[PDB]
Amino acid sequence: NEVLMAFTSYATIILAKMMFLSSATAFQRLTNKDEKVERVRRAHLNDLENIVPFLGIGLLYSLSGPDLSTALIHFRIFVGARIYHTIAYLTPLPQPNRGLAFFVGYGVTLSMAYRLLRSRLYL
Amino acid sequence: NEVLMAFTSYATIILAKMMFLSSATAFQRLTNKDEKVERVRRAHLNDLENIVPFLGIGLLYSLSGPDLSTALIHFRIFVGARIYHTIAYLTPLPQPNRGLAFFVGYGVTLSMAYRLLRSRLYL
Amino acid sequence: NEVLMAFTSYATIILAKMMFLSSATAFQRLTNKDEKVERVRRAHLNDLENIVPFLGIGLLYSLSGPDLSTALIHFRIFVGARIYHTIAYLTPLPQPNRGLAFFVGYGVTLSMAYRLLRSRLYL
Numbered sequence A, B, C: 001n002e003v004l005m006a007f008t009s010y011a012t013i014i015l016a017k018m019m020f021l022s023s024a025t026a027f028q029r030l031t032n033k034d035e036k037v038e039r040v041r042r043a044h045l046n047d048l049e050n051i052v053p054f055l056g057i058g059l060l061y062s063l064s065g066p067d068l069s070t071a072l073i074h075f076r077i078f079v080g081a082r083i084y085h086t087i088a089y090l091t092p093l094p095q096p097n098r099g100l101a102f103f104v105g106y107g108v109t110l111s112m113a114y115r116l117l118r119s120r121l122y123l
């Protein structure tokens, strides 16, 4: 429960996230058309891989999530970090393609990656 | 069972799908060589992400799939939609890179995404 | 256990793998800068998809992994194949982008893909 509770919710978000944004980018791509080209391309793949390792990591301490400890918060903020980070980006075809923005997204993937990873594993 | 039954099968397909097609594209890429360049590149990533969110969504109502309701059919046709959709595409390096074809694939990802997602979640 | 044991470990590796390598490439990309451009781009996506289907396949005989038979070894060497394969590659922006190296990585994905896939499925 506590467990299912966690994963679905994060992912659902995550997947409302990645979902609007995917078809959406598709939809805008053709609609914009071009700068928006990479913009859209761009959203997909950073995010697609935000998710891609989200998926690795979440999905797994998922079904290996024994300890009672509260860790979902990061499942939760890493989402929270990464969304506003893309969203912050968020149209500049010029590099920078990054910023404090992703010092948030990636780097939280990193922190919440790092701890929780190690956590349900070594236990 | 009913459950395992579902996921493996869809994925197996899905993964026979994504699998021939991956090494295959590799194999053809070098063999064609060039137009086939993006063609192959092309197959991977639409499909790679067909799968990528397949994976998100399937995999999860997977292990959160309680209701008796018949929903696998779409696991099943969204595959059925997406394969023939790429396959329909399926060599034009000119945009369009889409069509009624993906009005099928993506959009079923969308429908079968949308309902089943919400379904085992809100329950 | 035996099961959890398996998946986490492979993935952890896999995910220490894909993880250093992702932020890392990011980090080097900006730092190199350019040839390193595709190099880094390059690492991500072969590997990102090494993982991408790893994820499909591992993750699933994962929770459908009944037989006692020893199959983790490949979870294990396919990792072992693929790492040293990228790593072998591993800076040439000239094609070849492949070699005996990936005759290892991909092709083990293939062998260990192929058998274990079929195995916990048909059972």
Ligand SMILES: CCCCCCCCCCCCCCCCCC(=O)OC[C@@H](COP(=O)([O-])OCC[N+](C)(C)C)OC(=O)CCCCCCCCCCCCCCCCC
Pocket (backbone or CB within 6 Å): A084, A088, A089, A090, A091, A092, A101
């Ligand atoms: C609950 C907390 C108690 C107190 C709350 C009070 C907090 C109030 C914060 C007030 C802030 C004051 C504003 C100064 C900021 C100026 C920033 C700036 O100049 O831009 C930098 C710019 C710099 O831009 P740039 O010029 O480098 O590039 C832009 C791109 N070009 C140039 C191509 C156009 O960086 C960004 O754009 C980042 C975007 C920030 C987006 C912020 C929106 C998200 C905020 C989330 C939190 C909000 C509440 C959610 C709560 C939900 C509740 C559960």
Ligand SMILES: CCCCCCCCCCCCCCCCCC(=O)OC[C@@H](COP(=O)([O-])OCC[N+](C)(C)C)OC(=O)CCCCCCCCCCCCCCCCC
Pocket (backbone or CB within 6 Å): A073, A076, A077, A078, A081, A103, A104, A105, A107, A108, A109, A111
């Ligand atoms: C943008 C900036 C960068 C962002 C990148 C990523 C984010 C980086 C995160 C960094 C780590 C932050 C550290 C916080 C934790 C440190 C505190 C600590 O250790 O104290 C002990 C811990 C543990 O609790 P305790 O140990 O004090 O309690 C003792 C009770 N016994 C021993 C009997 C069990 O305290 C907490 O952290 C509690 C925090 C709870 C969070 C607040 C919400 C609780 C309510 C739940 C529902 C609320 C709705 C929210 C839903 C959100 C919807 C979107």
Ligand SMILES: CCCCCCCCCCCCCCCCCC(=O)OC[C@@H](COP(=O)([O-])OCC[N+](C)(C)C)OC(=O)CCCCCCCCCCCCCCCCC
Pocket (backbone or CB within 6 Å): B084, B088, B089, B090, B091, B092, B101
């Ligand atoms: C069981 C049902 C009862 C009745 C079955 C009877 C159904 C019989 C349907 C007969 C159809 C009549 C044909 C008219 C169609 C003409 C289409 C056309 O012109 O092409 C559009 C074209 C338009 O092309 P275009 O010109 O825009 O671009 C092509 C690309 N260039 C130009 C670069 C070369 O679009 C497509 O290519 C789509 C490809 C369609 C592929 C169809 C094969 C898959 C069909 C799956 C179902 C088959 C059975 C599976 C059953 C399994 C059983 C469990």
Ligand SMILES: CCCCCCCCCCCCCCCCCC(=O)OC[C@@H](COP(=O)([O-])OCC[N+](C)(C)C)OC(=O)CCCCCCCCCCCCCCCCC
Pocket (backbone or CB within 6 Å): B073, B076, B077, B078, B081, B103, B104, B105, B107, B108, B109, B111
């Ligand atoms: C290319 C075009 C776009 C494609 C994109 C994606 C596809 C879009 C899908 C859109 C939705 C379609 C709606 C269909 C459902 C609506 C019907 C409905 O609501 O009625 C009630 C529902 C529910 O059943 P019921 O409620 O009528 O039964 C009552 C019994 N009690 C109450 C006691 C439990 O009926 C059905 O849908 C039954 C359909 C079953 C499907 C037919 C096959 C059954 C046999 C199984 C094995 C067959 C082998 C197949 C293997 C395939 C291999 C590849």
Ligand SMILES: CCCCCCCCCCCCCCCCCC(=O)OC[C@@H](COP(=O)([O-])OCC[N+](C)(C)C)OC(=O)CCCCCCCCCCCCCCCCC
Pocket (backbone or CB within 6 Å): C084, C088, C089, C090, C091, C092, C101
């Ligand atoms: C335990 C076993 C018992 C015996 C152990 C004894 C084994 C000892 C093997 C000794 C080998 C002798 C060396 C001859 C090889 C020459 C290769 C060559 O020329 O390069 C080809 C080259 C050809 O290069 P190229 O010229 O086509 O392209 C390079 C790119 N450019 C040109 C752009 C610069 O291919 C490679 O680079 C492949 C890289 C190989 C990397 C090997 C390191 C990994 C080895 C893993 C095993 C090690 C132990 C791990 C054990 C862990 C324990 C649990």
Ligand SMILES: CCCCCCCCCCCCCCCCCC(=O)OC[C@@H](COP(=O)([O-])OCC[N+](C)(C)C)OC(=O)CCCCCCCCCCCCCCCCC
Pocket (backbone or CB within 6 Å): C073, C076, C077, C078, C081, C103, C104, C105, C107, C108, C109, C111
């Ligand atoms: C770079 C080159 C390409 C690489 C690409 C991918 C790799 C390709 C792999 C190809 C397949 C290789 C075939 C090997 C198996 C064939 C042998 C066989 O069938 O015999 C019967 C099998 C089965 O056992 P058995 O059937 O003989 O035992 C009988 C006992 N009863 C019947 C009662 C149950 O034997 C084995 O394979 C045992 C091998 C075990 C592996 C050795 C290690 C065991 C110790 C565990 C801990 C060690 C630490 C290691 C951790 C690693 C850390 C990173």
Ligand SMILES: N[C@@H](CCC(=O)N[C@@H](CS[C@H]1C([N+](=O)[O-])=C[C@@H]([N+](=O)[O-])C=C1[N+](=O)[O-])C(=O)NCC(=O)O)C(=O)O
Pocket (backbone or CB within 6 Å): A042, A044, A045, A046, A047, A049, A050, A095, A097, A098, A099, A102, A105, A106, A107, C026, C029, C030, C040, C041, C044, C045
């Ligand atoms: N889908 C591609 C995305 C590659 C990409 O956008 N690369 C960015 C940096 S990654 C960027 C980022 N960062 O650099 O901080 C971090 C990040 N993350 O942490 O997730 C996401 C990034 N992004 O822009 O997508 C870049 O500078 N490309 C060179 C160019 O445009 O010429 C991949 O997987 O490799």
Ligand SMILES: N[C@@H](CCC(=O)N[C@@H](CS[C@H]1C([N+](=O)[O-])=C[C@@H]([N+](=O)[O-])C=C1[N+](=O)[O-])C(=O)NCC(=O)O)C(=O)O
Pocket (backbone or CB within 6 Å): A026, A029, A030, A040, A041, A044, A045, B042, B044, B045, B046, B047, B049, B050, B095, B097, B098, B099, B102, B105, B106, B107
């Ligand atoms: N792997 C890349 C694929 C990007 C791509 O092929 N973009 C297509 C549209 S996506 C296309 C699609 N569509 O547009 O309808 C929908 C789709 N889907 O629903 O899955 C898949 C698409 N595709 O061609 O792969 C395009 O028009 N690119 C600009 C160009 O070639 O210059 C990514 O993840 O962003």
Ligand SMILES: N[C@@H](CCC(=O)N[C@@H](CS[C@H]1C([N+](=O)[O-])=C[C@@H]([N+](=O)[O-])C=C1[N+](=O)[O-])C(=O)NCC(=O)O)C(=O)O
Pocket (backbone or CB within 6 Å): B026, B029, B030, B040, B041, B044, B045, C042, C044, C045, C046, C047, C049, C050, C095, C097, C098, C099, C102, C105, C106, C107
């Ligand atoms: N992320 C891209 C990666 C595409 C890519 O690097 N393509 C390589 C071949 S794939 C290569 C490979 N191989 O060809 O043997 C196999 C492999 N694998 O088995 O995983 C990985 C490869 N790689 O270089 O990433 C290529 O030759 N591109 C054309 C060009 O650079 O102009 C995708 O998913 O399509």
